[PDB]
Symmetry: D2
Subunit: 247 residues, 4 copies
């Protein structure tokens, strides 16, 4: 299959990546160098045109460059670890809230058998849906435009849960009840205060606790001057993991 | 889903995790405290017995505590990112060599639809099969006890490839040939020397180059004394990613 | 400059450093390889005997390998930054408490013109003096065996202060008074809880606030296999810096 | 002593530091907020006016915000560790080249008793002098405008050396000869290629080898949302340290 028009492509030029829809007679220009989308439409993946390499985007590239952000997203750095740390596969059901823009959801969807997501704000609920539908994702996802505390969530049936909210300690009882015995949970908390607060509240519900931070550092890809890049993302969030306690 | 005899359990006591097979009359003793396995048979996951929390192990815990190591392994820190970075799902076929102890393979197998894996050393080839089989994994894996260079491999059948060998640059042409157009490739390299050498020749075959290292720092999960651990894994390997260029 | 009987030497063997007194008739053995100290005495610095390289220790090696530890110490990774971040030189007077084992003191002493140090525990007060004198350090230091709250400290004579105690917020007013206008202050705090607590109480005393953590990753020094070490120190403490606000 | 006109002051407003010369009638605007210098002149350090805190700058702030950069500089993160790692004090003479903009020099000058620095490029030689002079530094520094290879330097008179050039391996024999027995040496190298090459070259001249990289992560200083900053400096350089081997 060759490059069709109207489809989103990943363009590499120098150190930088670009995501662009292949619309006729439109172009990408970067520092005097021009790539015309008309020369791309009809070519295979991995073509080199005037210094521009063109491919179809991966899941990581789709999330980072394709997804509209109406809220703070969970980056692949974290979500690629989270999905598999939650011990997910195609035999498993996972609970997520809040959906936000669907950045974590896209990864949970790709790994798990079934996802139930909850998002209180209607705008973000529509945005996450749009994001995933746009890139052919989320066919195993049930979206709910409701506050998790008000939702009717089937008790004792989820193989895992992941919580991304400001104050997750207000939802611990219900999350606990939604899960199967011994099931993994994960929490995303940007702040140390939130983590301390969650650790104060979690003891009745989840054991085998783990808190981890993930750092990625990229390197220059030039052979003769191999070294780390000048800057890196320093922090996205503390990741909190546990396992359901019987009670 | 209560604990049955002979099955593997993950035990947490204090800061430590233990993986133990549930054998009759046998026990686990740490710092005086004893956990008798007869007392855990018939109990649900997330039961707490004498300060010991017991669960079934996750994929990460299986790899780290359960897999027999005849070689250096690829750690979940890296492999969880690798599997999804390579854009894998159930519709994808992935190439891997060398199999080694099967630690990366276990993750590839869970994420991908199909894996072809090559290991030249017979005892490593046997250990990898034993590792995954012991934990009910690798049902979608084709194991080959041959040097990849001698293998009969149809061209353009792989949606992704991952290479973990001392000198990957010798295999670039065959891997490129075995991949479908524009397909992701990844390389595991422990030393900067290897990365530098790979970067000399790689651009004849693969573009959209990325080199990243992944660091995990774990935290004390005590609410009142929240802080990072004393020590961490500093380095496992440099990860280099690319995409098949059309030749 | 030849090695004398009884002096402390830094011995390097393979990847490892050793600090030893040059005692006659004595030896160091590592992996069945033997260094005889009689062969070292009377030799120049930087001799190599039986694979062992022998030098006089530096400030960092003295603190790390030579100082007796009765308390948690401040490591050179932090202390080398701290002393210069506090803007110390030979025309500066610095306040420090608690002295502990004198590990930070050694650095403050080397950089600043004079140091007033306070330690409430007399066993620790004595150990710190023993450490420093043993290695010909601390001639510019006034040691006090007193609680800092009870100490007779002249107001406005200190160019900087550093506080290493469990609950530094109790002593803010007195440290503030002891400091010259706009003078730098630093705090060492192992936990996030402690930093959060100091930050809410420091508001009316110190401004230009900074919190930093310092990570050192070491590398293999083998040319053909250049890569980071397997393990590193993950955390020592958060460092909090401010400047005296005029009240 | 209150602020005088013509003084360079450190101004803190929100998260940002500013270094400005106190010019009468002049101001600093941060968006719509204004600080009038006429209100600062005649006031003590640590004064707060309309949200702006004003101090005199420390060595770190002088280097980072005050020094004119005509080369790549060595940052305080590295130089503060370097100066004390080289075991410098007021009884030590240190060799340095190339001087560059004088950022490392300022620190060596503050710590050592005497510095001999060499810079081949006349412009940078003048820049380094102008930088230190402007902030009342470097009175113990001998500046030379010459290639180190061509300079007449007394044998065995340096207690330490630091080398910041592209290819330091060329100067090893001379640096070695200029050093006292057992003396520390340091090298700054941006790339792994350079480190690899130096390690290949250094074996006959320097032992007790160490390679380290230093990372600083800064934190939000808001009590109720304590977390690391979003971004950090990922890499400045690899730091190589050794000790003179007897030849
Ligand atoms: C930081 S965003 C989640 C980002 C998401 N993980 C991603 O990767 O894009 C937090 C979201 O949770 C939603 N939320 C907060 N509390 C909720 C609740 N009680 N029930 C359902 N959604 C909630 C908010 O509306 C917000 O959109
Ligand atoms: C470091 S181990 C791989 C570890 C594995 N990735 C894991 O996670 O457990 C590398 C293995 O590749 C094998 N190997 C090297 N070259 C090979 C080749 N050309 N074909 C097949 N196997 C090869 C070696 O026998 C060795 O066991
Ligand atoms: C962690 S140790 C300091 C270690 C020291 N910075 C070093 O490098 O070796 C803390 C010390 O502070 C002392 N201390 C606590 N409160 C004090 C106070 N109010 N006045 C004097 N010393 C105090 C304790 O006795 C203890 O020795
Ligand atoms: C990276 S800059 C030095 C930066 C300096 N360490 C600082 O902190 O500002 C390298 C300098 O070394 C100088 N240089 C290179 N080779 C030299 C040599 N053989 N003798 C003297 N200077 C040399 C260059 O002119 C250049 O200014």
């Amino acid at each position: 299959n060759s490059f069709k028009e109207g489809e989103y492509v990943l363009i590499r030029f120098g150190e930088k990546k670009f995501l662009r829809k292949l619309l006729p007679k439109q172009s990408l220009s970067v520092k005097k160098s021009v790539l015309k989308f008309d020369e791309v439409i009809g070519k295979p993946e991995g073509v080199k045109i005037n210094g521009f390499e063109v491919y179809r985007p991966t899941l990581e590239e789709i999330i980072l460059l394709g997804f509209e952000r109406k809220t703070q997203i969970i980056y692949p750095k974290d979500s690629f670890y989270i999905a598999l740390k939650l011990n997910l596969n195609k035999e498993k059901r996972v609970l997520e809230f809040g959906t936000g823009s669907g950045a974590l959801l896209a990864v949970l969807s790709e790994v798990a058998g079934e996802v139930w997501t909850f998002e209180a704000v209607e705008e973000f609920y529509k945005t996450a849906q749009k994001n995933l539908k746009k890139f052919n994702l989320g066919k195993n996802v049930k979206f709910f435009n409701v506050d998790f505390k008000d939702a009717e969530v089937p008790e004792g049936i989820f193989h895992a849960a992941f919580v991304d909210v400001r104050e997750p300690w207000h939802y611990l009882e219900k999350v606990h009840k939604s899960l199967m015995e011994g099931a993994p949970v994960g929490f995303l908390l940007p702040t140390a205060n939130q983590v301390i607060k969650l650790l104060e509240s979690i003891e009745n519900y989840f054991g085998n606790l783990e808190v981890v931070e993930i750092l990625h550092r990229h390197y220059k890809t030039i052979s003769e001057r191999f070294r780390p890049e000048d800057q890196m993302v320093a922090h996205t969030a503390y990741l909190v993991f546990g396992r359901k306690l019987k009670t």
